[PDB]
Design a protein around this motif. Structure first.
Motif, PDB file in Angstrom:
ATOM      1  N   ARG A 151      -8.835  -6.043   4.504  1.00 20.51           N
ATOM      2  CA  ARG A 151      -8.857  -7.507   4.605  1.00 20.51           C
ATOM      3  C   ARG A 151      -7.547  -8.076   4.082  1.00 20.51           C
ATOM      4  N   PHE A 199       0.803  -1.242   0.000  1.00 17.11           N
ATOM      5  CA  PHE A 199       0.000   0.000   0.000  1.00 17.11           C
ATOM      6  C   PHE A 199       0.825   1.276   0.000  1.00 17.11           C
ATOM      7  N   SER A 228      -7.312 -10.166   1.774  1.00 17.54           N
ATOM      8  CA  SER A 228      -7.480 -10.207   0.328  1.00 17.54           C
ATOM      9  C   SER A 228      -7.184  -8.854  -0.342  1.00 17.54           C
ATOM     10  N   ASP A 229      -7.283  -7.754   0.398  1.00 17.02           N
ATOM     11  CA  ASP A 229      -6.935  -6.421  -0.148  1.00 17.02           C
ATOM     12  C   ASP A 229      -5.447  -6.245  -0.396  1.00 17.02           C
ATOM     13  N   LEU A 230      -4.629  -7.089   0.236  1.00 21.43           N
ATOM     14  CA  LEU A 230      -3.170  -6.976   0.179  1.00 21.43           C
ATOM     15  C   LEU A 230      -2.523  -7.509  -1.087  1.00 21.43           C
ATOM     16  N   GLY A 231      -3.241  -8.321  -1.863  1.00 17.51           N
ATOM     17  CA  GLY A 231      -2.688  -8.942  -3.090  1.00 17.51           C
ATOM     18  C   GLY A 231      -1.408  -9.715  -2.857  1.00 17.51           C
ATOM     19  N   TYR A 238      -0.431 -17.078  -1.483  1.00 14.63           N
ATOM     20  CA  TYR A 238      -1.850 -17.419  -1.626  1.00 14.63           C
ATOM     21  C   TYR A 238      -2.419 -18.164  -0.412  1.00 14.63           C
ATOM     22  N   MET A 268      -5.017 -16.421   3.850  1.00 20.02           N
ATOM     23  CA  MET A 268      -6.435 -16.263   3.535  1.00 20.02           C
ATOM     24  C   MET A 268      -7.179 -16.139   4.836  1.00 20.02           C
ATOM     25  N   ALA A 269      -8.271 -15.389   4.841  1.00 23.33           N
ATOM     26  CA  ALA A 269      -9.096 -15.257   6.032  1.00 23.33           C
ATOM     27  C   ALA A 269      -9.480 -16.637   6.546  1.00 23.33           C
TER      28      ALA A 269
END
Lengths: 513, 511, 511
Positions: free
Chosen positions: B424, B365, B426-429, B433, B436-437
């Motif tokens: 989240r 970010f 998932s917002d971090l890219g 992989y 994950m939450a």
């Protein structure tokens, strides 16, 4: 106690709908059919309208093929308001009462193909305005905002007579220059009166009209007899609102308002069914709720303590209905305590603040006796009540103004403002009855009695008459048969049939409830 | 290439779905009653000034409402008010005044204790919940946009009911809650106001996200609610920043008396028509935790009301935060540690940059500016305007006025309340992989926040960077009476192979 | 005749759909990241005053956000303001100031160009889009209801944030967008204001109707956005009509300097969990075109603020408009050709009658009056109050005041902004049942509009009747890289025999 482990749960990946890629496997393309705006009928009454808006008005207009399910009435008139102090700006002080067309019709009779439907629009809208969806209400009338308090002043921001240029959200306004057409005639120097032309186009709330579904109402079919008969009461007390801080000419106690040039038309779509819908079914069903006054009782309510004083010291008035005999169990009830006689003609309607409710059904007595006013508000809100607590409660709304030592004890009363007061909506299921047979739509006879405890806004040492009213709202359907016949009937079943019916927890239509 | 063939339909109004005997059914109804609605008194007399432990102990048979409420009543006396003050549109309550007053709550159901932190929970929840739900939670649901409230301004939550067209905007008198102002004597410098507030308790396992239709609890043979009562004026009472003070007084003095509290909840017998209740009932009961915090003394050398690009850019970076599993959501805010006034809006800093490290992946970010951080937070529910989030100077004309001398520009300046950034995993890219939450994978996180503060040039104050986790967590009610709660955790491999949900009795929890 | 038997159900609260292991699943999540969010600079330095061609040229691998935005920043200097003017609640931006500033845009995806007209598109779209989507589109989403704005009035979009309870109402300072007012010297007659606005681009094929969750574009080897930049004061800057002018000046003089523009769009690698992306992806990309226009000099002889029935009724009729297929929707508007003030609301006429001819069917809608035309437009999404639509006199008390001299009544009169009438071919009730949205049938249309204008008695101005078509149009992305677009056209016979759609992975486009 025992051996307990949380159960295994299956997992999914929540993902944005953007990843449901549109492809030839999941996209279809629409064309469209719709209800047209061609051959939209403007229907004149059978005789010239009563010039001051008071008297019977009849529309008699057979209509072929399909007719809109939510016909509207367009009224136009000129109001002359007299006794206004000279040099008054009137800014943000004049408008219309909520639902001014339906407020002006105490009784309506609709005839479809020889079947008559008698209903009471003014009574219906007084309840309906409090628990309908506010979005539907704005489609019903341009004047859909409901008063929260018993006085309106241009000095205050919660003012439904703010004009359009003073209103960021049009739904808040019943004022000029916002939702309805108007024209103020030129005012002469020194004048104490004003003339305003109004035009209002409002859906008629009268069985069997589809006033709950104004965007997309089911059409009527083959209205070979179609009459709409209105008890016209389009008079100033029903239509016209004047802010409580408009000043009066010396020696006059209220404004004098006259209606002239009254005209009324019924506006409704009419069209031929499109080819693509094929055969229209033989028997069409319409949801047409039946609202009835089940019981009323009144008393002269005298206050001995200041209504603007300590709230727990306000006089607690009690009214209890006589026993109300019902042959079947309604879907919903509404309780309200109304001031019988308005003291001002152009001000908000006044209800009492209900602080206690006790219900008897058959042998089951004292139901809701442990509820206080906030819980009564929650109960009503669970059944759609759509206004703020300070309206419902009937409490003193402007306490600082009244606590001011510069306001002499004598003027405290004159300046006090109260919530408009309560309407309590409750269903038979809210009562938690031990008799499991008392269910909405059961063909079981019941007896009900309602006790309401309430507070009133009259000054200490004065009183006024208040009326407790209990209304029923019953599930009721209208049936259109292919030969033209219409019928309506309550949807009634045995308790045993209802007890064994499958639960509904979430093209099929479910009516009633 | 050629576009593919697509099938056609005719869109038609639902009015032409003619109601007939083939497609109409008639409903009767069962529902949750308002009979036997319980008003539960505490085990001992409540503290007269709202300060102290408060306990409810009340077994309840059969079904109990999922969203119990607290009804508080009290009198507040506000002193040090300049004589002849009208007070019009200047007094009310802070947002969610009941939950703001409860630093810790313990709920016991059938011997299982749940410890949560209502004041901490609601401070966060108010910024990304559904505002319609928030209005069902409390009568005082409007959240401040700016760091000062004035009766001369139209965005004023202390405007009374007769001054408010939409009730949801007001925390003032005569609107959403019962009140009474005692008569005021000529020349008086104090006012006494009675209040009553009925607010849902925000404490696990209560169903405070589903107030209209919460799933009930069953067979509560032990039911205790133990509150750390801190119903003090700084938690409850709001006073506009343009009320004038008596000469020689720095702030208002407020006293609470007559304090009473009851717990209100529905209680009823299950209707015959629902048959047997299942053996194990599942409740969504999210777990909100402070994962990390760090503070500094932030000194400003340039005017906070000056050119925005010249405002001092303060930086705080958390220590590494070790987590044993991956939360569903995080929240970042930078708080002013010490309020300078007791009855004013809460102050946060304006976050202008954010950088996240997860395991070996650094600087995530760093390419976002403040508008994009607002968009990020809003995509996860942040529910206020940009001028609130940004912490920017909100009343620029007032400060640009040459008639306002340099010394008084600061005193008159108003700022956005400041930022909360919800994000989240998932917002971090992340290239990893497996992060994950709800994955049972251990991670390490560090958060750097760059921010601006409202203090005057040549002054400073302490600010605290806080990073909260919001974890998916479920409570289980077993029919033998036992309650348990547990995180919903799965292996990355389980999650990576799970089917997508891209969009009626099926319930999906977590996310 | 007897009423038919109807089956019964028991309506019950969803709370009694008890959550159990049989009906609960737990979600993890994937989503669109905020990492590698692109801030794309133009190929040449932006024009310093906002006027000139602007191109973004940036190949992007993998997935690109479907609703790219433009971030503009600039300083506006406003001159000719009377000395000692407070300017409180009087300065802001016009609605959708970015799209208002772009007369034409060309987007190239992998060699396929899409030419559209953002300023023309947004002028229509603002009136019948969902207001919640419009607020995601631009920070300045409020649309003017009347032809004048005054700070003395409460319906004032230049109310600043501290004066706005609901942020969506405001296009003013300190509310939805970043700003800075430079210090003002004693006696000054000018102000400088820095602005920053981040607004979605409304240009085919962007997904501006679905800003929360737009379908992404994939594998853009060529991605160019070519804008005709007209970021000039008349397109962007709003100034209340009660700001006073320095003696001898007729209007304000405004200069843009320091203009910068970037294109901001998410860009990310597809998550593993969505597996293979389909070979051909379809995007809804409606085609808006001007089908016909005609103008006249409209002279008023009676007072526009007089008896409404005596206002001059002007008539314009288009030439015959030949169309090769039947559009989904039409829009009719009568615009004042030449603004008399540069920074005021846009003026439309009030349409009081409409007559439509299609092929040999003439005089359609002749029986509708203005209220019914408003209902018609509203049925197709029109989203403003009747007093806006009608173009009626909005402030009748002011004009009726005998203390306002006959000569000043005109100057003080305020009118509704005027009409846009949206109608579909299905609204026309044509006896020719082959005239259906998306039919590949040639038609000829003529539109007659009767309207009232706001000019003073004894004056006039030019008005232009415009008829726009909105056609259902799809863009296709083939995995080999090719993009195509095409109208969705079918024979009348295909459409007549298509199944009715009277009411979740299936998507229905067009209509």
């Amino acid at each position: 106690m025992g051996m307990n482990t949380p159960p295994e749960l299956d997992t999914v990946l929540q993902a944005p709908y953007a990843y449901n890629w549109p492809t030839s496997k999941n996209v279809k393309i629409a064309s469209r059919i719709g209800i047209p705006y061609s051959t939209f009928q403007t229907i004149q009454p059978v005789s010239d309208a009563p010039n001051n808006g008071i008297g019977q008005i009849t529309f008699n207009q057979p209509l072929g093929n399909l007719t809109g399910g939510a016909p509207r009435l367009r009224v136009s008139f000129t109001a002359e308001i007299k006794n206004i102090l000279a040099d008054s700006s009137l800014k943000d002080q004049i408008g219309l009462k909520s639902f001014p067309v339906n407020r002006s019709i105490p009784v309506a009779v609709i005839n479809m193909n020889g079947k008559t439907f008698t209903s009471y629009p003014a009574q219906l809208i007084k309840l309906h305005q409090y628990n309908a969806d506010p979005l539907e209400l704005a489609l019903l009338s341009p004047c859909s905002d409901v008063d929260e308090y018993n006085k309106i002043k241009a000095v205050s921001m919660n003012n439904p007579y703010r004009q359009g240029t003073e209103s960021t959200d049009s739904r808040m306004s019943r004022g000029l220059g916002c939702n309805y057409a108007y024209y103020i005639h030129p005012r002469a120097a020194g004048s104490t009166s004003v003339k305003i032309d109004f035009v209002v186009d409002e859906a008629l709330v009268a069985n069997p009209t589809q006033y709950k579904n104004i965007k997309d109402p089911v059409p009527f079919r083959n209205l070979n007899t179609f009459k709409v008969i209105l008890d016209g009461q389009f008079k100033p007390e029903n239509m016209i609102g004047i802010a409580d801080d408009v000043k009066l000419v010396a020696g006059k106690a209220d404004f004098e308002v006259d209606i002239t040039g009254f005209k009324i038309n019924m506006l409704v779509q009419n069209w031929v069914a499109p080819l693509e819908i094929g055969d229209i079914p033989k028997t069409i069903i319409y949801n047409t709720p039946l609202i009835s006054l089940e019981g009323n009782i009144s008393s002269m309510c005298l206050n001995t303590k200041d209504p603007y004083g300590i709230p727990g010291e306000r006089n607690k008035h009690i009214l209890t209905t006589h026993s109300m005999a019902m042959n079947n169990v309604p879907s919903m009830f509404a309780v309200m305590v109304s001031q019988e006689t308005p003291t001002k003609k152009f001000a908000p309607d006044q209800l009492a603040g209900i602080i206690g409710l006790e219900i008897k059904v058959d042998s089951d007595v004292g139901i809701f006796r442990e509820l206080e006013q906030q819980q009564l508000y929650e109960l009503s809100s669970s059944n759609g009540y759509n206004k703020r607590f300070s309206c419902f409660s009937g409490a003193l709304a402007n306490g600082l103004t009244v606590a001011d030592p510069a306001v002499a004890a004598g003027n405290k009363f004159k300046e006090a403002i109260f919530g408009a007061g309560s309407v309590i909506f409750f269903r038979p299921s809210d009562l938690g009855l031990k008799d499991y047979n008392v269910m909405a739509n059961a063909n079981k006879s019941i007896n009900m009695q309602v006790q309401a405890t309430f507070v009133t806004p009259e000054a200490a040492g004065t009183g006024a008459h208040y009326k407790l009213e209990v209304f029923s709202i019953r599930d009721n359907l209208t049936y259109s048969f292919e030969d033209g016949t219409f019928m309506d009937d309550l949807t009634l079943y045995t308790p045993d049939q209802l007890l064994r019916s499958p639960l509904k927890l979430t093209l099929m239509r479910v009516m009633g409830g």
